[PDB]
Enzyme design. Structure first.
Site, PDB file in Angstrom:
ATOM      1  N   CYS A   1      36.111 -62.352   3.279  1.00  0.00           N
ATOM      2  CA  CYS A   1      36.511 -63.225   4.601  1.00  0.00           C
ATOM      3  C   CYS A   1      36.696 -62.514   5.753  1.00  0.00           C
ATOM      4  CB  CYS A   1      37.703 -64.184   4.211  1.00  0.00           C
ATOM      5  SG  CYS A   1      38.124 -65.158   5.700  1.00  0.00           S
TER       6      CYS A   1
ATOM      7  N   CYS B   1      39.244 -62.757   8.708  1.00  0.00           N
ATOM      8  CA  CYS B   1      40.678 -62.404   8.401  1.00  0.00           C
ATOM      9  C   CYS B   1      40.607 -60.718   7.951  1.00  0.00           C
ATOM     10  CB  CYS B   1      41.021 -62.898   6.773  1.00  0.00           C
ATOM     11  SG  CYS B   1      41.426 -64.874   6.843  1.00  0.00           S
TER      12      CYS B   1
END
Lengths: 169, 173, 173
Positions: free
Chosen positions: A128, A131
């Site tokens: 991700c 993030c």
């Protein structure tokens, strides 16, 4: 755990060579190394490795630290999915309110420098970017060398390799 | 569901509160609220978790329902790889017959909707945008809301957090 | 194969035809289709699938080969994460020096044009665009046909679908 380096097959020499070398550098202290090594391992889902690195990450990680790194893994598991998911929707849902509780990112215990870094590691493994990026930021700010952050990515990557090789035998 | 909550540690309270909230919630068709929690738990690949969202789902879903849910994860496990995959190749493979059968696409029981819903969910856990977008663009046609697709994503992400939270303790002792 | 196809549920009907279809392939070799199949199974992380495919594997694959496909999955497991993360950072680290040993890649034991097919298939399962693109480039360079590479991608996705499908049964009931 050395029994862990010993469990690796012979066609995965590199991973072994990279595990004994990453698990004994210096760029990262002990709480930052083992802490990342622990977080990454729970994130691979391979309990073998989690049991081993964890057993080793007891002579280095604090009681609170252990829970920390494991919390990081727990919470990034939800978020890594959420943010990457929203990110793929062209901002079309950026309006709503996620509602996802995460008081823990405020770390509920232990220094953020470390929490944040272990979150980096996990985000690298789960895949991700929204993030991985913000944590590199929250880190870079509070400090932390560009060297330390990189080594952590290296740590997440090597832990992932160990999990895979041990999961082929 | 209520059982699985006492499982998580003290370091994952958020996940717990998060889990009781997503289900306690009522933003979508109770069905949509389980074959999504299901297809999603199946997507996580944690055996413990799939078992519980397996219990409370025993007709909490319409039999052929689970089939659709569990069928969504199964077929998506294939699709999320192929499509993500083809999408990284500069389009040099956009004209080759991906002779991959996926007829379940014309969903069995469940009307061709909630399929794309938990389908969407699963696509989130796997990280395939290519698919996530199509299942969303389509979902936004059969009159499916948007607070509901959003609700699904929250569900998908929460179960994963529960999966990760559990799998770590399920091993260490 | 057969034993694995019957272990799969009914709703996973599409995967069945897929593994069955991918199995009797002509596009790829015996070594090719099988290292891919083997490396992909290892990559889905599902024990049972690694086992059924391995069992059948060590029959069309030489020891040096079976070891190579497993080494590919192992090494891509490290590399798919590193390279993906670094790409997420937008090259801001593109030259900080990885210092991560490989070489299994330099010389895998068997012909590269097969080890690459295997690394490709695994990068598709893990989802690293940086890696898939590199290995796909390399493949064409050494003569493999995009049909073949396309066949490897399919394999990987189908094998993935298998893992996911078999995983849920193994869990619930």
């Amino acid at each position: 755990i050395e029994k862990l380096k010993a469990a690796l097959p012979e066609y995965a020499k590199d991973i072994k060579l990279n595990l004994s070398s990453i698990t004994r550098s210096s760029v990262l202290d002990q709480e930052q190394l083992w802490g990342t090594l622990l977080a990454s391992a729970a994130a691979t889902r391979n309990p073998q490795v989690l049991a081993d690195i964890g057993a080793e990450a007891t002579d280095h990680l604090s009681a609170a630290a252990r829970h920390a790194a494991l919390g990081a893994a727990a919470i990034m598991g939800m978020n890594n999915v959420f943010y990457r998911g929203r990110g793929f929707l062209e901002g079309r849902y950026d309006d709503l309110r996620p509602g996802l509780r995460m008081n823990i990112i405020a770390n509920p215990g232990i220094p953020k420098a470390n929490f944040e870094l272990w979150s980096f590691a996990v985000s690298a493994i789960n895949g991700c970017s929204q993030c991985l990026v913000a944590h590199e930021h929250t880190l870079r700010t509070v400090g932390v060398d560009r060297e330390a952050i990189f080594e952590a990515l290296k740590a997440a990557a090597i832990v992932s390799g160990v999990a895979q090789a041990l999961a082929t035998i």
